[PDB]
Design a protein around this ligand. Sequence first.
Ligand code: 017
Ligand code: NA
Length: 330
Amino acid sequence: STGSATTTPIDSLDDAYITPVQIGTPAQTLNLDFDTGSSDLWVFSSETTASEVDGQTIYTPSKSTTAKLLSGATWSISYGDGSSSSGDVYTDTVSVGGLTVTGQAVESAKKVSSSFTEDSTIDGLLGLAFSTLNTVSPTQQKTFFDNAKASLDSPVFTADLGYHAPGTYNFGFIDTTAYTGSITYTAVSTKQGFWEWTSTGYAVGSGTFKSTSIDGIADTGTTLLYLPATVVSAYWAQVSGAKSSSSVGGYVFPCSATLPSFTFGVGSARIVIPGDYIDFGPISTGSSSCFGGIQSSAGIGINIFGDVALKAAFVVFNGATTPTLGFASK
Ligand SMILES: CC(C)CN(C[C@@H](O)[C@H](Cc1ccccc1)NC(=O)O[C@H]1CO[C@H]2OCC[C@H]21)S(=O)(=O)c1ccc(N)cc1
Ligand code: NA
């Protein structure tokens, strides 16, 4: 089997991407944030505290003839941005772009934190990291991809995110028209539960390539590119007027500035992020200062190849017995 679904930016700056997901019988369609850096599929629901719902579409398990409460199971998750959610667990039928999994664990939120409430465009998360990170207790549950994998034509999914435009998540096949050149594959460590890999280095603009190992995670759920402070300082030093602002929480730059590209290495191959992918718009409404899309990972504990990096590539998440990651230009 295969599936193919379009993913759409939530706003004009690509602050996140949402993908429609059919849950239950009859289908209830929710727009979920596909997140290769976490492993829970959770949704706003009829069980979510009423004051914490503000415009999201909810899943109502009592209206799904295929839903079954998973006895004794609860979940509770805390994310890198300080947000959180928690609740109980149903199994139900879940379809993405024509690919159907029966008995998928659907984590129904009883509580969500303020950031989730305040974002009316995201109805929940669909985690695509490794199932070892799933938070369901006392019996850990599998991701949508893990449940689907054996049925897929090939045990892979691909992310093809657009810059200020929709893109595509495919399951079970590689669309050879979606990229140029070849796909270069690179080793993955699953020891932290992430699609963790080692980039071979970077270049800024037209500068020469610096060979240096950068360990980080391929994360569709993170908006920006978070890298070591040395790398980030070298990038912003090439942007006239850019500065790190402790009040804003990162590097900012004059909104009209010409941003250089940023290149990262995948083995001997190179992925070039165009400069305008690095522009996240005014720091506050009406400001002449803009927020940068490459920021220091100091304090995170891990480097994150988020959407700023991934949207410059066609990315293969290869779930073979020994997982690997593939990157192609496009
Ligand atoms: C989309 C959000 C709901 C989650 N985010 C991305 C997500 O992939 C993070 C990415 C992530 C990963 C590690 C450290 C920080 C952030 N994963 C994460 O927090 O996973 C949690 C699952 O349980 C815990 O065990 C693993 C980490 C925890 S996020 O971290 O909040 C985030 C979102 C946007 C940006 N620009 C930066 C970070
Ligand atoms: Na394309």
